[PDB]
């Protein structure tokens, strides 16, 4: 019976069920045990919880794909901003300037091309903004030799930027790593995501422990006052019935 | 009582489906517990349905945006942005996986920094709170043990005292 | 409050800390002294009659 | 509420009332009984001298 | 069975208690250091909260 | 039904120690309060644990100081970048007026 209570209390943390309830109502306890699998740990229906977990997995996959692209996009924007700032400080080499101008122009053309191509359905009849077609924008691209050069150079710059960003993530999470060589930092970066997941898991475990301890504390706070009252009742009996009455009569005689 | 009873029976029928409802002791207390449980389940089922539908919508929206960004980058940077070196891909995966682990809106430092700080602060805060609660549990357990010992000692002393009083009463 | 009530009643009933006291210690001491003195008086009386 | 109800059922007599009764009874014994016993002790000592 | 539970239960209980107490006697001597460490911990928590 | 000679001796010692032997009811009440789980004997925060805590809090303090410094660097860097970005906005604003 104690096992049934523990099981039901762990799964149905909201139910205030005492041992007296299950002792007086044995068939009711069976019903609760049968209900526990049908009810998820959070009080929701098991089917709906399963559906929710499936839908969450799907979202995580899509998000992973989106994030991959988003990281690259952001890095490129950051790179462009950095090169722009250096261009204004007069510290940019002529090659860097050409690269910066070429890359900025390629991205801009691409962004604007898309503004025009509302992937909508060919309607052979849709009026473009300002009457511009995709081809009108492609003409504003730098010469094909410069575009290929910019794309080849970008790969090396992107990997360096990815490295710099990873090192920054690591440096913030583990500032002690800033005193370590690039090889050791690269090794630690390869574990960074797993370390963060572990820390998150640790937090979840500590929260569960907290809830358990809290449940125990509440039980003890329920039993303690009753025990004090029983002691008080015994002392009252000794004082009123024995000392003030029985013993006082004896002493007089 | 008749309305709550109807709600419980309907709810149990829904939960157990085609399986015959198991016989249980129908008393005021069992009905109250079942009723609270039924209300809680119904309210949670509603919340979970709304969350599940929203996540489906969000999954579609994220997919659409992913396609957009991929196309933008392919057209702007060429197919070569996807041909990163093994180490480059590893770095990219680690950033992505770190961001997913912290449930971030984006890969910016403005998002990563506060997330890491919050995770660290929450972990310490909860660990301290658990230590404090452990001390309180130990302290109360001691108080409870002392009180229980006292209760037994008082029961003994009272019995002895009652015997002694009876003996003296006989002498008197 | 419960703890305070319990401590106050207990202190009163257990003055020497170890034994439940039903009689006032001062009174218990006097009974013993009076019993002893009466025993002496009874000896003297028996001795004189004898 | 359960603990308060248990305190009210177990409260005849009120712990404060009971402590007062106990303290009064203690004072009564010291003022009346203890001196009476001392007087009797003294009387017994005089009777011994009479012997 | 009843006697065995009683015996084992009490032993278990007091074992748990003693274990809890024995740990304490050693502890009185270490009290000044405990107060100092507690003071230091409070000071460090306050500093951590400010940071 | 078997009580080893060791437990019997231990119990007799407990009886001799003058500690009240808890009746079955009392034991049930108190033992309920006992989570089977190995809650490790609260190793009474051994001065060592407090010391460990002080060490752990010092480590945390050092960490927060390092992270604050890093944040201040990132913040200064971003502030500079934000000012320069405003200059870009002004340059691009001029180029846009030329096109108009």
Based on CA atoms alone, the radius of gyration of chain D comes out at: 21 Å
Largest sheet report of chain A: none
- Approximate helicity band of chain A: over 70%
Class inferred from helices and paired strands of chain A:
mainly alpha
Q: What oligomeric state best describes the polypeptide chains here?
A: part of a larger assembly
Say how many strands of chain A there are: 0
Strand content of chain D: under 5%
Helix content of chain D: over 70%
The end-to-end span of chain D amounts to 71 Å
Give the strand content of chain A.
under 5%
Order of helices and strands of chain A: HHHHHHHHH
- Determine the number of helices of chain A (DSSP H or I, runs of at least 4 residues): 9
Question: In words, what does this structure look like?
Answer:
This is part of a larger assembly, with one copy of chain A (253 residues), one copy of chain B (172 residues), two copies of chain C and two copies of chain D (51 residues). Chain A has 253 residues and is mainly α. Helix content of chain A is 79%, strand content 0%. Chain A starts with a helix and ends with a helix. Chain B is mainly α and 172 residues long. Chain B is built from four helices and no strands. Chain B is elongated. Chain D is mainly alpha-helical. Chain D has two helices and no strands. The relative contact order of chain D is 0.07. Classes of the chains: A mainly alpha (253), B mainly alpha (172), C mainly alpha (50), D mainly alpha (51). At the C-D interface, α1 and α2 of C face α2 of D. Chain D: This is HAUS augmin-like complex subunit 5.
Q: Could you write a compact summary of the structure shown?
A:
The structure is cut from a larger assembly and holds one copy of chain A (253 residues), one copy of chain B (172 residues), two copies of chain C and two copies of chain D (51 residues). With 253 residues, chain A is an all-alpha fold.
Feature tags:
part of a larger assembly; 6 chains; C: 50 residues; mainly alpha; 2 helices; 74% helix; 0% strand; rod-shaped; D: 51 residues; HAUS augmin like complex subunit 4 L homeolog (chain A); microtubule minus-end binding (chain A)
